[model samples]
Target: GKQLTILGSTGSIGCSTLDVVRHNPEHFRVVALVAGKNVTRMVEQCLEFSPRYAVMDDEASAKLLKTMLQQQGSRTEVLSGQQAACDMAALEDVDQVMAAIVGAAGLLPTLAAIRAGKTILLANKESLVTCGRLFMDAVKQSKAQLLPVDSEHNAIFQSLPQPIQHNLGYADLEQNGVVSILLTGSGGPFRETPLRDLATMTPDQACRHPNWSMGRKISVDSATMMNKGLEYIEARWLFNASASQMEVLIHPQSVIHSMVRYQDGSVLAQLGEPDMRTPIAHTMAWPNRVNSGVKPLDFCKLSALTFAAPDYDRYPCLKLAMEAFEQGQAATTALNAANEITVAAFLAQQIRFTDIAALNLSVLEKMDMREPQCVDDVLSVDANAREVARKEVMRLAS
Candidate 1:
């Protein structure tokens, strides 16, 4: 059985991970769980799973969780702050760390797990998107078993050449008889929406993601197709895939999650229901299969799985991401930070849906993008990007 530390325990990914453990109790155990401010949910999780440690975002929230757990006569040690979350991730005996915390907040603890040489289930794409070079280096140096917890990346991980999958260092796809990676996306809800209509689209309309339900911020990203762009940046690092070696496909059906095409025209794809638990369980019981307890994909209800190329005009966010990526790592980090602020402002009704793309483009153009030499440098870039992005939001929101 693997001992697991679930970061962002109150979030969707962490909850799905706990669900996997709940079903396969014999194969996994929870050692420590961390959350932000969802004290009620954290307390509920503690009472049920009874993990040894739980960490909250700040001291006040942590103390509240501690008190709540104590009221129930629970022994779960509640630690406070981001460092405490990082400490849990680097715990001495933790077999695996589920670094599922959202956005830039997730970076350090995820890196801590990699440095600790623990089996890291990376659900936090920002860690790689923001600090791809640093993260890949740490995983290489520490020899950490870094597994993909995102469904698309997990599918790519499942579809990769075994040696490259086993050790991602300076991966050569040709050496492993691999040709290219087909990273498939659903093209999001706005894929077919008339271009002119997008400008006035509401947050609810944006959040009405067609394939999978997601949080407000992510749903907004999905609508903008920036989620896939972020995934694209992360995919390059995750698979050691060059720009030429990777292709993003728009599969409206979403039946085929992702695919790996080979030199001999052999295309391997990992198909499943669009459930995160599938990827979560896959990483949890890697090199082996376990019942994900998710409903299986039914090909019997046969529908056509058609594909199309994305329009850069429609997905300006994706275009900006690609441009930023080509510019360098700092550009990608800035793009991500800017997008986060842009999305939040959109959610708060501070900006229109179309303004998201416009604002992100403007922010990228305004920022002095610099290559980060260290984690601190990467963070500084991220902070500066957010600051500028926030200013843009206020200027627009006013």
Candidate 2:
């Protein structure tokens, strides 16, 4: 059995990954579970999995989880704070680390897994978006194997040849006969909403994703097409792709997760249900198929699939993200950090839903930081962009 440490164990991706482990107990073992302040769920997971260590983001939650686990006679040890999470991620006995944590906070622990040269099942997009070169360079240096857990990236990984798949971050796609990477999105709940109504859309409306269930922050990003933008940036780092080598398409049904076009006039596509478990299970058991507990797709019952080029006017944030990558790491880091703040503000109703992208662009335009030299430099860029985004949000709300 492969020993596993699941970071962000209580989040949607973490829970889905656990489901894959649950269904394949014979093949995988839970060694550590790291999560935010969700002691109740942590207690249940710790009791069920009996992992060697359980880590929380804060001390109070860790203490509470410890007391609860103790009363339940569980042997799982509890640790607290970000450093503890990082330590658990790099645990020597763990064969794989599921990097599922969201936002900039996920970067360090996921990096810890990469530095340890663990087989990183990467669900945290920020680690790549905010620190693509640094993280990929570390992967090359440490010889870490990166298996993307996102549905699109995982699909891209699946459709590639064996050699390119193995050499993930540094693959020479042109040599491998690859022409382009087709990244797809569902266009979210607002894909068809009238442009005039966009300014008045509430958080609840933006979060009503038509196809997939996800966290509120991501749901909002999807509505604004910023999620696709971030994934575009991630794909660049993961595939060694340039802007010209990648194209974004709106696939409303999300039936075809993504595609790879080859120079030999062939396009390979991975199709399945819009379920994260499919990709999670695929990455968990690479080169072999495992039962992800996802139902087989019934093509007859599905609606007609469709594709379209994204309307730049409708998704300014997506355009900004594409440009930010070319501007370099600092710009992408700033854009990601600013998007986080703006999304939170919009979700809280402190700013209009449309203001999410407006504020993101405002923050990006104001940022002039050089390329991030290290993780600390990345954090500084993130923090500075967040402050600027907050001020922009205040101005909009006031």
Candidate 3:
């Protein structure tokens, strides 16, 4: 049985991971768990999984969780603060680390796990979005087995060959397979909504994904199609491919999770019902398939699978992400930080939905992109970008 550390146990990915462990109790053991400000949910997870260590975002919340767990006679050690979370991720007993913590907050702990040479199941795309080169470099130096837990990336991972070999001349992906990746998107709730009415989009309306049950932030990203753009930047690093080598397809059905077309004109796809557990299980087992408790895709009862080109004019965040990819380094970091703050402000009703992308673009244009010498540099850029984004929000509000 593999010993696992779940970095964001209270979130969607973490919850799904627990469900997988619950179903296959004998296959895995929970060694560590971490959450941000969700003490009640963290306490419940601790009671159920009984991990060796649990960390909370704040000291007070950690104390509350410790008290709650102690009341139930649970012996799980509770730790608090960001550094504690990183320590939990780097624990010696953990064989597999599920880096599911959301946003830039997840970067340090996830990097810590990779440095520890644990088999990392990465669900947090923001880490890569903000620090792709540094993260990948650490993975290479540590010789850590990095597995993608995002459904799209996992699908592409499933389609590609293990011990992937590339033969330059022939361009035969089977011999030198997976020339490019086709990242699929469901186009979110606004796919058919009129553009004129997009300015009036509410948090509830933005979070309503047509085909997937995701967190509100991610659901909103889907609506803006920024999620797909972020995935594009992530795919560039995940597959070691250029922006031109990747393409986005708006597949409304979402059955075909993602596809990889070889230089030999063969396209392989990992198709399944749109469920987080599928990717979670795929990454957890890896090189081996396990039952994820999700049902098989029923093509017999299915309707048509439709595909369309992404409308960049409608979703400028996608364009911005592409621009960031070309710019490299701190540019992507700034874009991610600015976007996160901008999106949060929009969700809080401090700005209009259109302002989310507008503010990101404006901030990106203003910020100076520099080479990230280390993790500190990335964090510094992220911090500065967020500060600028906050100021932009205030300016727009005024």
Candidate 4:
């Protein structure tokens, strides 16, 4: 059995991961679980899994979880703070880590897991969105294995030629005879809404994703198609894909999660029910297969999987993110942080849905993007971008 540590163990991805583990207990022994301030859920997980360590990124929440664990007679040791989460992720006893923490906050711990040479099931796309250069370099130096857990990226991973599929760190698409990857998205609920009415849309409207249950932050990104754009950047590093070799296909059904077109005109796609567990199980049993507990896709009952190009007018954030990716690592780093700040404001009703892209544009213009040589450089840009984005939100709201 693989020794596992799940970061963001209280999140949608984490919960889905544990569900996969539950279905295949013989293959995994969870050693650690890390989360934010969800003490109630954390206590429940601790009592159930009895991991060696349970961590919360917040100290107060950790204290509360510790008391709950003690009262319940659970032996799981409780730890607090982001540093503790990072330390747990790097523990030598842990064989695999589910890197599911939501944003740039996930970077350090995720990097810790990579440097520790653990097989990283990468559910957090922001790590690559903000620090692609540095993160991939760490994977190179440490020879850490990274398995794509995002449904789209995992689909691409499944479609790649076998050799490149095995060693993603050195995947030169052209060298591997791969032509392109078609990254697919559902275009969210507002795909057909009148552009002018986007300004009137609410958080509820934005977060109501048509397919795949996700966190509110990610749901809004999906609504704007910024999630696809971030995945675009992720695919660039994940598969060593050039901008020319990647195209975003808006698959409304999301049944064909993603596809890879080959040099010989054959396009291979991984299609299944839109379950995160499928990808989690794939990573958990890579080089082998496992039952994900996802029901078999009844292709006979399937509807048409339509494809369309995204309207830049409605999804301005998607365009902004792509442009930022083409600019440099620093620009993408700033774009990611700016989007996080703007998304929080939009979710809190401080800004309209349409303002997300506008605020991202303003923050990107304000940020002095530079060469990011280290994690600190990437983080400095992230902090500055958030500051600028917050100011833009206040000004827009005022």
Error in Å for residue 186 of model 1:
1.3
**TM-score against native, each model:** 0.96, 0.96, 0.92, 0.94
**Arrange candidates by TM-score, highest first: which order?**
2, 1, 4, 3
Checking candidate 4 for backbone clashes, the offending pairs are none
**Which residue runs does candidate 2 get wrong by more than 4 Å?**
none
For each of the candidates, the C-alpha root-mean-square deviation to the true structure, in angstroms, is: 1.6, 1.5, 3.0, 1.8
| Candidate 2 residue lDDT tens string, 34-82 | 9999999899889888799999999999999999998999979899989
Note the Cα lDDT for every prediction shown: 0.89, 0.92, 0.86, 0.89
Q: Could you tell me which residue pairs clash in candidate 1?
A: none
Instruction: State the lDDT of candidate 4 residue by residue for 1-398, as single tens digits.
Output: 99999999999899999888888888888999999999999998888777999999887998899998999999899998889999889988999999999776798999999999899999987788878888888898888889999889999898888888777856688887788989999999899998879999999988899966778998999999998988888889888888899898888998898999988889999999987899989998997899989999998998887999888887888789889888888888888888899999999999989889888898888876676888888889888888899888998889
User: What lDDT score is found at residue 276 in candidate 3?
Assistant: 87
Compute the lDDT for candidate 3.
0.86
Candidate scoring better on TM-score of 1 and 4: 1
Off by over 4 Å in 1: none
Question: Could you give candidate 1's per-residue lDDT for residues 1-398 as a string of tens digits?
Answer: 98989999898898899999999889988999999999999999999898999999898998998898889999999898889999999999889999999776788889899999999999887788889999999998999988998988899899887798778645788788888889888888888989999888999888987777878988988888898899999988888888888888889888888999998999999998888999999999987988888997888984788999889888989878877888889899999999999999998899999999999988888987669988889989999999999999999878
